[PDB]
Amino acid sequence: LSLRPYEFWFVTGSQHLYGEEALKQVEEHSRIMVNEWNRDFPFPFVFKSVVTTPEEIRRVCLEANASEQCAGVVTWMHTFSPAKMWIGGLLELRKPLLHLHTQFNRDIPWDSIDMDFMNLNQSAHGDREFGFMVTRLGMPRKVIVGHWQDAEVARRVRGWAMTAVAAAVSRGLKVARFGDNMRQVAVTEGDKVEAEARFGWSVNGYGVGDLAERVRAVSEAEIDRLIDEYQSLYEFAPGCEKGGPLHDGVREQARIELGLRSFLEEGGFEAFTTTFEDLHGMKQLPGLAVQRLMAEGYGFGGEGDWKTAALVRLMKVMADGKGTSFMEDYTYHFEPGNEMILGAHMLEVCPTIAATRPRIEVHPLSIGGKEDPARLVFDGGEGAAVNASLIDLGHRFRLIVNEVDAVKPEHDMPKLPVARILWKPRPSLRDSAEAWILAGGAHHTCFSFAVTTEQLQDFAEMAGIECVVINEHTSVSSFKNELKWNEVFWRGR
Amino acid sequence: MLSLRPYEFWFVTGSQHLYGEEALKQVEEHSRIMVNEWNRDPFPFVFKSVVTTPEEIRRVCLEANASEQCAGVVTWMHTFSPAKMWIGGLLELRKPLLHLHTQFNRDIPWDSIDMDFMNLNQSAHGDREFGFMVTRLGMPRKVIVGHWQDAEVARRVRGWAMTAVAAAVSRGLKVARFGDNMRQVAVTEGDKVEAEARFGWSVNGYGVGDLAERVRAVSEDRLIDEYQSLYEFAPGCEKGGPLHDGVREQARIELGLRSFLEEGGFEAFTTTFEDLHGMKQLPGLAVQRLMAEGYGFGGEGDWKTAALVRLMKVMADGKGTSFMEDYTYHFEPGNEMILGAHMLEVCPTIAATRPRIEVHPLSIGGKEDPARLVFDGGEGAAVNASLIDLGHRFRLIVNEVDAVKPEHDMPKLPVARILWKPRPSLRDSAEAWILAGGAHHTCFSFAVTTEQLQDFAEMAGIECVVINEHTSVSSFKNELKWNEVFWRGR
Amino acid sequence: MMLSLRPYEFWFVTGSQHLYGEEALKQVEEHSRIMVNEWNRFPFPFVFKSVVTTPEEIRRVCLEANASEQCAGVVTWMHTFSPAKMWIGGLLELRKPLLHLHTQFNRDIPWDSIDMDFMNLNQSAHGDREFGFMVTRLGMPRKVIVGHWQDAEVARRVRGWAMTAVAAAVSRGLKVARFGDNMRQVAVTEGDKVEAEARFGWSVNGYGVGDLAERVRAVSEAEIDRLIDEYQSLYEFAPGCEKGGPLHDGVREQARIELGLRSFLEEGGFEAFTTTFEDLHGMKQLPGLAVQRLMAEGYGFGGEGDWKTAALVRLMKVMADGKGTSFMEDYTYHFEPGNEMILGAHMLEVCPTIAATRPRIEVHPLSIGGKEDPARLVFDGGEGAAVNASLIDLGHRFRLIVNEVDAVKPEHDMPKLPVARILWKPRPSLRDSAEAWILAGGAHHTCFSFAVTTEQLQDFAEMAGIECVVINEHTSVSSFKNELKWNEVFWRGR
Ligand SMILES: OC[C@@H](O)[C@@H](O)[C@@H](O)CO
Ligand SMILES: OC[C@@H](O)[C@@H](O)[C@@H](O)CO
Ligand SMILES: OC[C@@H](O)[C@@H](O)[C@@H](O)CO
Ligand SMILES: [Mn+2]
Numbered sequence A: 001l002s003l004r005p006y007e008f009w010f011v012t013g014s015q016h017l018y019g020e021e022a023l024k025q026v027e028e029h030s031r032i033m034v035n036e037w038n039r040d041f042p043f044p045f046v047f048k049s050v051v052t053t054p055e056e057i058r059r060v061c062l063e064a065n066a067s068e069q070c071a072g073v074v075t076w077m078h079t080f081s082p083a084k085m086w087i088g089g090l091l092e093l094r095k096p097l098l099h100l101h102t103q104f105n106r107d108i109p110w111d112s113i114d115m116d117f118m119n120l121n122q123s124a125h126g127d128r129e130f131g132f133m134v135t136r137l138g139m140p141r142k143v144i145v146g147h148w149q150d151a152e153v154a155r156r157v158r159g160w161a162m163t164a165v166a167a168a169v170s171r172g173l174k175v176a177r178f179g180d181n182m183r184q185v186a187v188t189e190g191d192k193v194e195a196e197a198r199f200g201w202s203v204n205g206y207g208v209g210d211l212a213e214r215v216r217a218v219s220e221a222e223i224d225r226l227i228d229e230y231q232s233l234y235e236f237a238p239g240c241e242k243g244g245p246l247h248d249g250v251r252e253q254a255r256i257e258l259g260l261r262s263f264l265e266e267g268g269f270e271a272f273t274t275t276f277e278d279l280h281g282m283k284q285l286p287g288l289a290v291q292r293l294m295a296e297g298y299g300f301g302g303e304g305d306w307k308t309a310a311l312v313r314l315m316k317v318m319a320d321g322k323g324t325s326f327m328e329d330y331t332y333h334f335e336p337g338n339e340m341i342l343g344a345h346m347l348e349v350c351p352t353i354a355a356t357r358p359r360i361e362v363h364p365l366s367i368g369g370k371e372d373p374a375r376l377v378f379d380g381g382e383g384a385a386v387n388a389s390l391i392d393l394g395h396r397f398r399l400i401v402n403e404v405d406a407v408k409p410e411h412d413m414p415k416l417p418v419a420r421i422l423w424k425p426r427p428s429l430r431d432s433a434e435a436w437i438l439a440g441g442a443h444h445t446c447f448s449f450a451v452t453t454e455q456l457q458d459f460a461e462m463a464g465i466e467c468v469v470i471n472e473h474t475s476v477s478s479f480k481n482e483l484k485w486n487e488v489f490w491r492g493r
Numbered sequence B: 001m002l003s004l005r006p007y008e009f010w011f012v013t014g015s016q017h018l019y020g021e022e023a024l025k026q027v028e029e030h031s032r033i034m035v036n037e038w039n040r041d042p043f044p045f046v047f048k049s050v051v052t053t054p055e056e057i058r059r060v061c062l063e064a065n066a067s068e069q070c071a072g073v074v075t076w077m078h079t080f081s082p083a084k085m086w087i088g089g090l091l092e093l094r095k096p097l098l099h100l101h102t103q104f105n106r107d108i109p110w111d112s113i114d115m116d117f118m119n120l121n122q123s124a125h126g127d128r129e130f131g132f133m134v135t136r137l138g139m140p141r142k143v144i145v146g147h148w149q150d151a152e153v154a155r156r157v158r159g160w161a162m163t164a165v166a167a168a169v170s171r172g173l174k175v176a177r178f179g180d181n182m183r184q185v186a187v188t189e190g191d192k193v194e195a196e197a198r199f200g201w202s203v204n205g206y207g208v209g210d211l212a213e214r215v216r217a218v219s220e221d222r223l224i225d226e227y228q229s230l231y232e233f234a235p236g237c238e239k240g241g242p243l244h245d246g247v248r249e250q251a252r253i254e255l256g257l258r259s260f261l262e263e264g265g266f267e268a269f270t271t272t273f274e275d276l277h278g279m280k281q282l283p284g285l286a287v288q289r290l291m292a293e294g295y296g297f298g299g300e301g302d303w304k305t306a307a308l309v310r311l312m313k314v315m316a317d318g319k320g321t322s323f324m325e326d327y328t329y330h331f332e333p334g335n336e337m338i339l340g341a342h343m344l345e346v347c348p349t350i351a352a353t354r355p356r357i358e359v360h361p362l363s364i365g366g367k368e369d370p371a372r373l374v375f376d377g378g379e380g381a382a383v384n385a386s387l388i389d390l391g392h393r394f395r396l397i398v399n400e401v402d403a404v405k406p407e408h409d410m411p412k413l414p415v416a417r418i419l420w421k422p423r424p425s426l427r428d429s430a431e432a433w434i435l436a437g438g439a440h441h442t443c444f445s446f447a448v449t450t451e452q453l454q455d456f457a458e459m460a461g462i463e464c465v466v467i468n469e470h471t472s473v474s475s476f477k478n479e480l481k482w483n484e485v486f487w488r489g490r
Numbered sequence C: 001m002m003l004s005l006r007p008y009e010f011w012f013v014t015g016s017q018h019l020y021g022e023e024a025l026k027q028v029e030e031h032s033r034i035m036v037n038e039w040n041r042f043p044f045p046f047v048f049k050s051v052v053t054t055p056e057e058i059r060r061v062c063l064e065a066n067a068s069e070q071c072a073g074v075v076t077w078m079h080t081f082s083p084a085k086m087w088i089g090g091l092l093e094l095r096k097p098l099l100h101l102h103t104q105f106n107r108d109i110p111w112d113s114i115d116m117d118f119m120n121l122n123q124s125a126h127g128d129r130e131f132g133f134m135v136t137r138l139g140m141p142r143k144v145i146v147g148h149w150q151d152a153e154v155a156r157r158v159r160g161w162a163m164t165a166v167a168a169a170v171s172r173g174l175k176v177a178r179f180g181d182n183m184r185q186v187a188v189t190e191g192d193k194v195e196a197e198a199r200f201g202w203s204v205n206g207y208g209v210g211d212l213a214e215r216v217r218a219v220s221e222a223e224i225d226r227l228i229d230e231y232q233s234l235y236e237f238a239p240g241c242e243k244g245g246p247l248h249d250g251v252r253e254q255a256r257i258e259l260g261l262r263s264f265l266e267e268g269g270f271e272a273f274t275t276t277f278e279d280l281h282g283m284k285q286l287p288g289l290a291v292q293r294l295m296a297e298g299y300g301f302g303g304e305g306d307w308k309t310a311a312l313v314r315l316m317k318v319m320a321d322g323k324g325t326s327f328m329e330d331y332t333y334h335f336e337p338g339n340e341m342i343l344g345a346h347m348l349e350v351c352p353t354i355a356a357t358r359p360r361i362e363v364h365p366l367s368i369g370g371k372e373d374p375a376r377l378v379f380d381g382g383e384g385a386a387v388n389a390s391l392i393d394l395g396h397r398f399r400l401i402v403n404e405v406d407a408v409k410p411e412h413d414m415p416k417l418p419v420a421r422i423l424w425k426p427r428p429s430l431r432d433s434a435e436a437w438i439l440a441g442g443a444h445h446t447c448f449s450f451a452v453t454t455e456q457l458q459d460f461a462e463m464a465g466i467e468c469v470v471i472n473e474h475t476s477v478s479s480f481k482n483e484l485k486w487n488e489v490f491w492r493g494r
């Protein structure tokens, strides 16, 4: 779906107390690091000034704050960089911060190491004084410690940069709701205002007839063109091929796909929701059309679930677009020793989780009482994964993350007419769900194979919301205590 | 004339067996005398027995909780009524509690008063001990002190009785939203879930296609017969070749709205002008008429004001109460006043003029020239109430205003309008209103008092701020700071 | 002279939407430009920025406000309805003092004219309210001024607030130089410099008095002569203190300190400094006339290492346009029934901008510092309304305390009092203010101003996010105690 050319500003801190020539060794050391990271992290590191004064620090932050291509700031105290200088800038920095607690040389030059070296590569105490200052200001930030060349440091920096880029998409992110929330449903509700203060989301509701007229203007020739792209991608079920009568169903989806994309592109929407209780002017419920916009980059939520729509977009950004989709727990496999969750949804499951080459099928749909819709049908993949809900507790949001394991279906489901994925939640179906329910997790989630818990925890930190994680170490007792103690901490905020 | 259930108020009298069973006979006799006399002229009072045991106390409360006719409980400690007895019942009670701290005789019978009297007529301390237990439980309740025949006691119960009835309406209240919120608008947004938990409001959004289908149905028309039975018309009248399908389209909108609202049980609704697919006209004259039946309305998807209007119309007994919006100011020194209106939907029950039907263009929403009631609003003391979501909790903001007759007419203004002089001044009240965060949409009423709205906040468990003749802006900011610290969490 | 001020400007931003055409934007734009131009005829220039209509326009002007070191405050006005969720991103970014001007181009309703087009364009009655909601919902502090934009009171209030916001923009830059540490064992002059740099923006750092001693040794004796010619330009000399007199030595020393002090503080960019009599190595006198001179030029100062008051004196002087503001200390009480007064001085350092007598250079012994007889300006303070302000550290947060007072002309001369002085009558009473002051924890060091109001100090405290308590004619000690209690619960979190 294409991102801004986001970049990370690498701001090195120092002080005049060793001279202007030591300020040159620092500028050199910093440029060598930035340039050597950029030999590759699909976002360039931009080396900015060595900063030595309150004013230089304050302005790199002011500038960071304002450049929309800056998606995070990485700050490293090369020398001692007295941290009160950093206050004024740190107060203004509202882009994500990473404190790279590193060091140019990797190993203590025994036989060399004198005071001249001790005056230059003193990161070991410089970063701690800067660390104090960021803590003393209550500022959320990521802290990674190691040599700037170590392979794990880059892993952590790479993971964090993906998160910071999501954070930047989040700032802009405009969501288009096509109809209200499903009536009397609770979890898909919330304060769009608060989500806009907290996450930057503009969560935009347009009457479904705005969408209905967009899909009528769509030429039959544009439909013909997309259909050849389906042929290029997705095997068709019987009767869906251009001859069979199911094609007016497949072509309508493709028509909806074109009315939608036209609309979402005209407004700069990167996420959107539909509602089956409001489909006036529509022939079908958006299904394969929704499935495809997801795979391209859009976030979706069913039944007006703007929260998960935004969440889906955001987790697509973190995953580099891969292995991520809106999700809904639909039934359980409770077979002792083999207990599984079956995740699916009405129509809308993104093909980027597919281990089967997706296949356009067409089936009836009781819900909404509109045309028998077309939709991609496939089995979700296998491997470690995460399932994420963002909910509104009223006074604040909570992000719930279940580390799960998706499994290859042992048997077929030929009568199941929508996309399907199986997964065994950690630490068990029993405790994951109890924990999930105590946490209040929604039924809508964003399932992903590529977003790691650490990234979502890092996103929550950046946004300043609670993130609770259900994984293999989760005990329900202590998890109850986490929810009690986190609640104490997050009031006000 | 939107009807309420026959709401009743359960008088409960508390006592104990320390004085005997003929003392109880007198406690029951006094209470029936009181309830009976109050019932010779709002809503009936029902004497509900003298309760004397935890279990009798718990019973009547459970009974109150489940009686959807019970809009409030009125409790009175005729004697000492040991208050722990009351815990398990007060814990259950979820209906408005009025603690009527009263006494049967008015005077101390000096010549006669003996220990058998002070055993029996000891509300003086029994009510204080009940006082402690309700306070000790944190419970919201009204307290009214005075003789049960005292005229002022009556005015205050009648007032509280109106708030309690509105509170019961609140617990039923179902709101239909035709379209979402107007776009990028902040104050009309909020948390429908929380508002359901705090006020009992069921706020549910129907796509306007649903309301568009129900007005593709008829009764031709009978409606227009009574339009002329009520309202002046303008050129655009009946023949009115130009503009009559304007009025026949609002009349159409009115009957499909009413059919949708009466079908689903909605006493409040909202329209948004940004979703009008299938509507030839943004609703206007239709909405003003539904409001005058008692419906709550909020423009641009404003459910909180929609609900608020409903409850204030119920508090007001249908009178002088309308969706409102500060539209423009008149800063003329010494004569500063606000022009409240809305793009169409002002309820005629605030009119001091005969309502006139006009049909004028309306750019907004890009639909046909809507028909609407145009009229000048009345004068006299009033309140202007906004209810906002601060994110963690709701805030009811109430401004006492003085509505004024307009000295100059506004002959090319196509909407109904009212002028008021807000207390204590345009400059300070607006400042307070803005510090408090009050919406542009409000409920104006001539017949809801501030005390009522405050009492509703108590029932509801929310902050109520009031801007009136005694408001300083600087102390008002303190009140906001101090309230916010009390109300967060709660 | 007077300490220099960056050219500060206030940005006038006006909000509206696209639901009305391109043409209405044109009229809103002209309306604001008219209002701004008529305003510049206010203390500092107003700059009409833009009509903002989108999220990204609101955010950019806000980013530009934070960045613009010339911008002292943003003045927002919602001409029409400006859906406030648009303003979230901008308001969350804005860190400049915000005034919300709730106003209206036209003063009166055109009764014969008014129609939907007018109701669609002059919508502030609600557009500002929708904006008031969003600002309140983010918990941001702002000023809110309501009136027609030509209103005289609207101007008086905007001038007060602008003076404040320029004091705030100085506070962010503000650099304080402590020559010496706190007077040993003193509590109220202590505090958290880190917290104060985070809250108010003040950079507060210690130099050894050695750094200043050596800077005064490098003063020419030719510039010292140039300065005495300026003392003759300005100040009456007590017997034995002009050129040739026995105690004119002492004035020269205070000339030398002044010129060294000024060179240290001009070199570093410091607008406020502190000295301590317990640390005077390398100086022949505790600085005094020098300080008095420097405060007169607009420097903040606090005795005994008191950076908090030093910063406060500089800020209030900015608020007061340099006029009638001075460091102050309650020295002694006149308790006479019906004439209760406080004599307020310091041991040397009272700024002459509060003088009612023409200041007189004098030289007297001073036990305190252990150094030579210090020269100093001596005068009787003027009379009238004034505020006495103190900023203290409660440990977890700052508290601004402001007493309204009425300065009085001395009825009886004080011939054997070697220091400048002022006499004031604290509202509502001496016994009640001192009680409320002591309960508030007021320092003995104050900043005293004839030209700073309480509403300005409150506005300053609102901008910084700190508690301000005012002691004046309406203050009763029982309700004051409750204010302190209830304020504490509010200010604990934040
Ligand atoms: O500028 C800092 C300095 O060089 C050393 O960090 C200190 O002396 C010891 O921390
Ligand atoms: O005569 C009843 C009487 O009310 C009680 O026994 C006590 O005074 C309450 O302490
Ligand atoms: O909410 C303000 C008012 O109701 C309307 O939004 C304006 O007239 C048109 O935006
Ligand atoms: Mn669903």
Ligand SMILES: [Mn+2]
Residues within 6 Å of the ligand: B299, B300, B325, B342, B441
């Ligand atoms: Mn409106």
Ligand SMILES: [Mn+2]
Residues within 6 Å of the ligand: A191, A194, A394, A395, A396, B190, B191, B194, B389, B390, B391, B392, B393
């Ligand atoms: Mn909320």
Ligand SMILES: [Mn+2]
Residues within 6 Å of the ligand: C303, C304, C329, C346, C445
């Ligand atoms: Mn002192």
